Amino acid sequence: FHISSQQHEKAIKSYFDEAQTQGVIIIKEGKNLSTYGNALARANKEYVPASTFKMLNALIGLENHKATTNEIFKWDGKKRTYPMWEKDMTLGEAMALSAVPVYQELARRTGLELMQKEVKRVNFGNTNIGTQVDNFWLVGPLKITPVQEVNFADDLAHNRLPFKLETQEEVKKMLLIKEVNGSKIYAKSGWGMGVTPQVGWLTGWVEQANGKKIPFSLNLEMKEGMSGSIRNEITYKSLENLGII
Ligand SMILES: *C(=O)N1C[C@H](NOS(=O)(=O)O)C=C(C)[C@H]1C(N)=O
């Protein structure tokens, strides 16, 4: 509270500087958006959502009865990119493992026509899914800005998306990634590997002990031989530096 704004800005900038990348973290407090990091002009640029799209894919599939939260999506027995994905799992387990095949199956069940209408109805990013129902969030044409991502998180955190309360609660349940002091962090990571440069995301919110929710979206460039966990590490250091956790 005695810490100056200049010092907070310099500290958060230094976390991106030390990771040797370029990025931002946008923090929302009520209606006010604060942009931190070492590349502030990223805030209104469009990037593929990559696996952050699982949040919406889940809302859509549950709302439209394409799956339930208890349903087991069977592994087809084919080799996957990660061994951890070679198993049968729920949507919730697949969210935590970020198992793309499960979410591609969900997207196929939803189908292109319904997916396009639902993405349009929620006004997510540029709202364009093109003609390929199973990869539109990974390689384009769907794009979204870091400001749009944090505003999406804010909407979900406060149950303002146009889905049933229950549907929003089911998906939020799936997004708990960390508890620190009395605070819970709900978020989804994203890593656009099929585009150049690659984009890294961690979008979510903090629920504080008192019940206040502070949405955030980290957005940065993922570089060759960078670990996925740098997204989490920069996020947790930034939130701690600002006294949010
Ligand atoms: C999502 O953006 N994914 C699926 C998987 N997990 O991504 S995550 O690290 O953001 O949670 C791995 C990917 C590289 C990526 C993808 N494009 O398939």
TrEMBL record:
<keyword id="KW-0378">Hydrolase</keyword>
<dbReference type="GO" id="GO:0016787">
    <property type="term" value="F:hydrolase activity"/>
</dbReference>
<keyword id="KW-0614">Plasmid</keyword>
<feature type="domain" description="Penicillin-binding protein transpeptidase">
    <location>
        <begin position="28"/>
        <end position="239"/>
    </location>
</feature>
<dbReference type="GO" id="GO:0008658">
    <property type="term" value="F:penicillin binding"/>
</dbReference>
<dbReference type="InterPro" id="IPR001460">
    <property type="entry name" value="PCN-bd_Tpept"/>
</dbReference>
<protein>
    <submittedName>
        <fullName>Beta-lactamase</fullName>
    </submittedName>
</protein>
<dbReference type="InterPro" id="IPR012338">
    <property type="entry name" value="Beta-lactam/transpept-like"/>
</dbReference>
<dbReference type="Pfam" id="PF00905">
    <property type="entry name" value="Transpeptidase"/>
</dbReference>
<feature type="modified residue" description="N6-carboxylysine">
    <location>
        <position position="54"/>
    </location>
</feature>
<keyword id="KW-0732">Signal</keyword>
